Design a protein around this nucleic acid. Structure first.
Ligand SMILES: [Mg+2]
Ligand SMILES: [Mg+2]
Ligand SMILES: [Mg+2]
Length: 297
DNA sequence: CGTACACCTGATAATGGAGGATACC
DNA sequence: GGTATCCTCCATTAT
DNA sequence: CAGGTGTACG
């Protein structure tokens, strides 16, 4: 387990796992008829709770860490004042690079409006609803019916987004990457199974450009599409690239969260493979046991 | 024998919401 | 009253 | 996120 936090790592992690949300709830007690709330949220498996704790401390002890689902916890900041004072200045200096950036810049604009209390104003609210419409899944049915006049504000959409620091990658992969160990059944290998190591990152196709630039950035790998939908894998299967490129990279720029343990086990598997012990029965069982302990606690 | 890119599919916690209660001015 | 935050729970799909 | 397979190639 690893919870040392660096700004760029946090940004990578938030690009992987965070959400910038705007809620506009109907409620007769508010003059406009609507309550406007802005929320910054990161949800993880409960095995990474310690990571949410380091994140809270990273952001000045602000926010709340709460049970989200069956085996997950949420870290959330929902105080307008608090979002403006620390969250915005952080992400203005250390900018997101995925499509999450677009949600961020919209979310930032609603906060600018909330800062001058324009959300408590009919025209202010309409402008916020226009913003909400281009954030995440956009307008609810109830909001669309309540403001059927409103033109979504254009989704900003950046240009060549280029990996800003090695720690960014560290954080990003700590969220949406994986270090895979496979045992493939083989008829040519004496021992009956091929030990294969795979480094992989998964992301929605809308971030194809970023995904493609990982091939230059790391000097290896390739992209594939999931035939079942819009979802891309950056993948390294070449064991020379794993040892010469990926393993050294994440030895310097460290995985955060419980996935650090997994990278460490994956490395041990790579050592057994380096020494060629994976083609003996004992080395194969060593990998099976390292393989089964992985992603646990 | 052994490896590696192209292709395949399962699991489930995230992704991104929601509703009700209460604090605060 | 008006407004701002806390607290608990969830269905579909990006991991 | 994660576990596999088919098969060309040295
Ligand atoms: Mg993600
Ligand atoms: Mg994750
Ligand atoms: Mg998951």
């Amino acid at each position: 387990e690893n919870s040392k936090l660096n700004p760029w790592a946090v940004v990578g992690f938030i690009d992987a796992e965070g959400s910038f949300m705007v809620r506009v709830r109907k409620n007769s007690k508010y003059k406009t008829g609507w309550l406007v709330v802005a929320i910054f949220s990161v949800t993880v498996d409960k095995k990474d709770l310690f990571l949410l704790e380091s994140l809270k401390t990273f952001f000045g002890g602000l926010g709340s860490i709460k049970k989200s689902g069956n085996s997950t916890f949420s870290y959330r900041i929902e105080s307008s004042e608090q979002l403006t004072k620390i969250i915005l200045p952080f992400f203005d200096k250390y900018s997101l690079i995925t499509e999450a950036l677009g949600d961020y810049l919209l979310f930032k604009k609603v906060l600018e409006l909330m800062g001058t209390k324009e959300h408590l104003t009919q025209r202010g609210l309409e402008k916020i609803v226009s913003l909400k419409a281009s954030i995440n899944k956009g307008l609810s049915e109830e909001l669309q019916a309540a403001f059927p006049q409103c033109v979504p504000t254009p989704r900003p959409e950046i240009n060549n987004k280029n990996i800003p620091d090695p720690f960014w990658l560290a954080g990003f992969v700590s969220g949406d990457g994986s270090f895979k160990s496979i045992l493939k059944k083989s008829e040519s290998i004496k021992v009956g199974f091929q030990s294969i190591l795979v480094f992989q990152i998964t992301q929605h196709a809308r971030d194809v450009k970023l995904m493609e630039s990982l091939i230059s950035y790391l000097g290896c790998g390739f992209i594939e599409k999931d035939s079942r939908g819009p979802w891309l894998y950056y993948t390294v299967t070449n064991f020379s690239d794993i040892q010469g490129k990926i393993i050294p990279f994440f030895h310097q720029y460290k995985i955060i969260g419980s996935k650090y343990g997994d990278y460490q086990d994956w490395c041990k598997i790579a050592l057994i493979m380096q020494n060629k012990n994976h083609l003996t029965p004992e080395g194969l069982n060593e990998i099976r046991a390292l393989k089964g302990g992985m992603n646990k606690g």
